Design a protein around this nucleic acid. Sequence first.
RNA 1: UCAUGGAGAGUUCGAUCCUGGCUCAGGAUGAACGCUGGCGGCAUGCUUAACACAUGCAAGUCGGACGGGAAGUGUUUCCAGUGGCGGACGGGUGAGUAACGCGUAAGAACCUGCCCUUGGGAGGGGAACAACAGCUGGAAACGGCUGCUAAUACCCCGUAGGCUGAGAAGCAAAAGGAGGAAUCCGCCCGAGGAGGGGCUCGCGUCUGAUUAGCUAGUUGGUGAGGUAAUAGCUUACCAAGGCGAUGAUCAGUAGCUGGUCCGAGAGGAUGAUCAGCCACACUGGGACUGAGACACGGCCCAGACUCCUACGGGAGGCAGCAGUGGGGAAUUUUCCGCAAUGGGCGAAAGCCUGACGGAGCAAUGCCGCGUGGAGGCAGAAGGCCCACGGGUCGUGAACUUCUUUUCCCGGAGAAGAAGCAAUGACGGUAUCCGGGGAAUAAGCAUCGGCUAACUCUGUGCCAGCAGCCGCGGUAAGACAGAGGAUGCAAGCGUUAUCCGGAAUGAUUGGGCGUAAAGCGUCUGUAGGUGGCUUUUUAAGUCCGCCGUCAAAUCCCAGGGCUCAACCCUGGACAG
Lengths: 80, 78, 105, 123
Amino acid sequence: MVKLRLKRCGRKQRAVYRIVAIDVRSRREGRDLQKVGFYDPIKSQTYLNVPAILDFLEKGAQPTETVYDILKRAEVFKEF
Amino acid sequence: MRSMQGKVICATNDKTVNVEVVRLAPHPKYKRRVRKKKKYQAHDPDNQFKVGDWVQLDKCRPISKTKTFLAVAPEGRQ
Amino acid sequence: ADSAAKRTRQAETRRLRNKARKSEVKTRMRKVFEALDALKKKSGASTEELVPIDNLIAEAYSAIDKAVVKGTLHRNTAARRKSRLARNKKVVEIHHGWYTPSLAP
Amino acid sequence: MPTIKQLIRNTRQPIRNVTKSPALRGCPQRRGTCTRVYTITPKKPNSALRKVARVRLTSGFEITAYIPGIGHNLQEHSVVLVRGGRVKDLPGVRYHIVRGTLDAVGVKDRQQGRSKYGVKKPK
RNA sequence: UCAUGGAGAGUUCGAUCCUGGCUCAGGAUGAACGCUGGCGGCAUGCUUAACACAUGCAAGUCGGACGGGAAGUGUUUCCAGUGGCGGACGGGUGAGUAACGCGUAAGAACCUGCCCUUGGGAGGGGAACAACAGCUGGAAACGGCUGCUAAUACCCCGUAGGCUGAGAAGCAAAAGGAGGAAUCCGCCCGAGGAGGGGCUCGCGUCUGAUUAGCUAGUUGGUGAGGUAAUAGCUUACCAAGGCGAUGAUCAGUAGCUGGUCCGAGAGGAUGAUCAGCCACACUGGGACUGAGACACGGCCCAGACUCCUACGGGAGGCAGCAGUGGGGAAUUUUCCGCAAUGGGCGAAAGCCUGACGGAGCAAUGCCGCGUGGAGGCAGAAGGCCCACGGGUCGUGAACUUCUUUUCCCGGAGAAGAAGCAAUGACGGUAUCCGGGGAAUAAGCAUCGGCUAACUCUGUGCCAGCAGCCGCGGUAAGACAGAGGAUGCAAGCGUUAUCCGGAAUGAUUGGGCGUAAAGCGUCUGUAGGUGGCUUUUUAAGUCCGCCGUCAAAUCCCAGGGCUCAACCCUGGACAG
C-alpha cells in the first residue's frame, strides 16, 4: 500500500521533514492524498494531525521505521 | 454531467444516428460567443429516430469506435 | 561461475515456464479442439440427438477439466476461463438450439 | 476590423524580431577561419580604408567580418572569433571580430577601454 | 474607500505639423567572450552530436524454503545451484508524438502480488530436474551423453459459499518452515477496501490553402472468434457510410503542464534545475514470465558499429554516475559515505543502493560582508591645466591614534542521531576564546545628443569610432593619450536570445478623400447582426452552497537560519 514516510523539505544541512502518506512506489519527494504530519529534528515541534493518521493506519498503510518511532513517542496507537 | 441535445442529421445506418451538437463557446482572445458544431454517432436498438428529430446524448459503454452514446429522448419542458 | 547472475537465473526460469505453459495451454487447445470437432460431427450427420450427448458431455468435461486446471495455475485469469467455458457451452447451446431441445426466454 | 468575424478569423501576426545576424545562429559568437583579409571603402560621405577579414565560420556560412582596433596580426588561414554588430559604413559587413581571443592578438598600446580590445593591464 | 500601474528621446525637411520605419534608455538569462578578481551563504553547471565510448561502480537479497560442498574443530561462518520476491521502482534524455499523449472534467465494461479487514480450508500418493560424480568437446564463451538426489520445485485422486450452463449436470486447491512448547511467518480458495494501473468521452491543445478532397476494415450492422474489459481488436457477409472550406488529408515544427520571464492591464514569449504525466533505451521487429513490461543495465532475430580469437567462433550497448574522444563560443571530480532519508530482501541480525546525503572546481547566478574608523598645520614634493595671479588632483596622501569583519598563529568545539546503549561521510567542518597586526585585499565602462560626466596634447577624410544621427580634410567636448569627472562595484562591459517601449497586428487600443489601404458595380448562398408589446423554459447571464484545479511557485501574515538570499507553518482572492 501507501507507506507513511518522511520527505526532506529544506536547504542543505537542514533536515525539515514532512510526514506524507504517499504510495510506496513513488520517489521520496512526490505527491500525496493528504500530507499529514511534520517532523523537525533540529529542535522544533511536530504537528501530527491524529485523526488522519488514524484514518490511514485504520486503512492499513504501514509506516516506515522512524515514522513509526515518532508514532511511538505520542500515544497515537488505538485499535478501533 | 449534462446531456448533449441536438438534431439528427442522417440515419441511413442501422441502430446508428449522426447528431449535430451545437455548442456556444466564448472565443478566447476576442470575447464573443462563437458556435461550434460537432456531430456524433449515437446508438439506438429501437432505431426510432428519423431525419431531423432532436435527441439528447448520454455517455454509455462504447459500442464501436465512434458509437459511444445512446440517445433516448429529451424532457420537453418547452 | 560468476559471483552474481541474477538475471540469467530469471531467463533460465523463464525458459522452463515457457516450456510448461506453452505445453499445457496446447493441451487445452487440443481438448477444446476435440470437443468442438465432435460437436461439428453431430451437427452434420447424427440423426438421433438426445441419446449420444454422453460422449460430448464426457469430452466437454475433459475440456472443463484442463480449462479450470489451467485456471488454477496462473496462466489464465478469471474471465479467460469464464469466456472459454462460456464459449463451449455457447456452441453446445447452439447445436441444441437448432434442434430438439427447445429453449426460449 | 470588426470584433465579429474579420478578426476571429485572424488579425494578422507580426513576423518576429528579425535576426540581426543570420550567422551566429545558435548563440552569440562563433569561431571563424580567415579566407581573405582585404580592405574596402565605405559609402560616399566617409573616407577610410577599413580592413575586413572575409571569414568562413563553423556554422556553415561564409561572411565578411570587420576587424576593430589599430594593429592586426590576421594573415591568411588564421582562426578568429566573430561576434555580431553592424558596421554601418560598409555594405555587407555585418559582423565584428573579437580581439584578444584565439589567434587574434590585442591591439597595440591601448590604455583606454581595454576590455573591448583584449589588452591586459600595464603597470 | 479602491487604487501601488502606463515617462521619453534621436532620425526624413531651409524650417512646421503628421503618417511611418529604424535605433536607444528597462528587465531577464541554464548563457558566451574580454578586462579585473577578497571572503561567505544558498542555488546552477553539454542549450550543441538521441555522437561514438576505454576503466571502475550504478540490483540485490533470502541458509528461518531445499539438496549438496568448503573453511574453521559439539559449535559457527560462507558458498555456485534449484526455489521466493525484487530486476516493471528509483536514475537519464527529449528523438518521436499535433494525439485522450498531456491538462481539466465526467464515465463504465475491468485487472490488481506485496497492504489492511473478513469467511472457510490444508488428507493421500507419485515422477524428475539442476546441483553433484564420471567420460568428453571447446583457446575462451559455452557445452554434450551416462547415472543419482531434495524441496514452499512439478504431476495425479478426493474435498470447495467459486465457475460454466436455462436447468440438468459437471468442473476446480493446498506447503511447509522456525521454535521444547506457547506461537509466529507462511500457503489455497473466496468477499471487500485503499493505493496502483487498463480503457472511454465533453472541452483546451502550433503554423501553412502557392496542400482540396480524403477514407474501402474505411464508417456502420450481424455472426464467428479475441482481449483482464468495451471496441473493426480480428475475420466472413450485408449496408454505404464516415471526415472536411469552422481547414479534413498532406507537408513542416513541438514532449505536455503546474510553472519561468515580461507587461500597468489584457495578455506576449517560453517549458533548464523543482514537481506530475508520456515516450525512448545502438537502429529496427518480435514474443516470453509475472500481479504489472513488449522490460535502459532481461531473452530471441535482423541491420550498422567496436573488442577478443588459437580463425572455428564469441562478446557489447554511459541518453546511470564519474570520465575519455569528437562537435562546440560553453558547461565540472575516473571523490567520500550509507550517518540520515527513501527503496529492495530477510523472522531478526544485517546486506546492497553513483537514488540520496556530503565534499571538490567555476564570480555561472541571487544575497550579505571587507579593502579601514576618527583626526590631518591647510605647510611641503609632484601630475595636469591656466588671461602665469593661480586652480585642481586634495583630507586625498604623507602623518598621529582606535579597531580586527576578514588574514595569520594557537586552544576549545557542536547539534544533525531515532530515550536500551552504541551508531557521523560531512569534520575536528560550523561556531566560540586568546595573541600580533592597517595590516592581506578596486576594478571596469562612459564623458557629441538620448545620457550623468570635459578640458588639454597628438593626428589631419589618415588612423580610426559608432547603438541611431553621424564625427574625422589643422587648434576635433565623437579618433588615440593624459589629467579630471561620471556611473557602477567584486564586479564592469560587448554580443546573442525573449518581452517591454511598440497604440509598430489595435478585445482593452489603430486606420482606409489626398499619407500604406474601399473590391469596378450589382444580385445572392452559407454565415453574422436585427423592430415593438405580452407569456413560457433558463442555454447564455447573475447569486448562494458544494466538489475539484497535486505539492512546490507567486500574494498576505508569522517563524527560523546574526540579517538577507533561502528554508518552513497557516491562510486566500481571483479564475
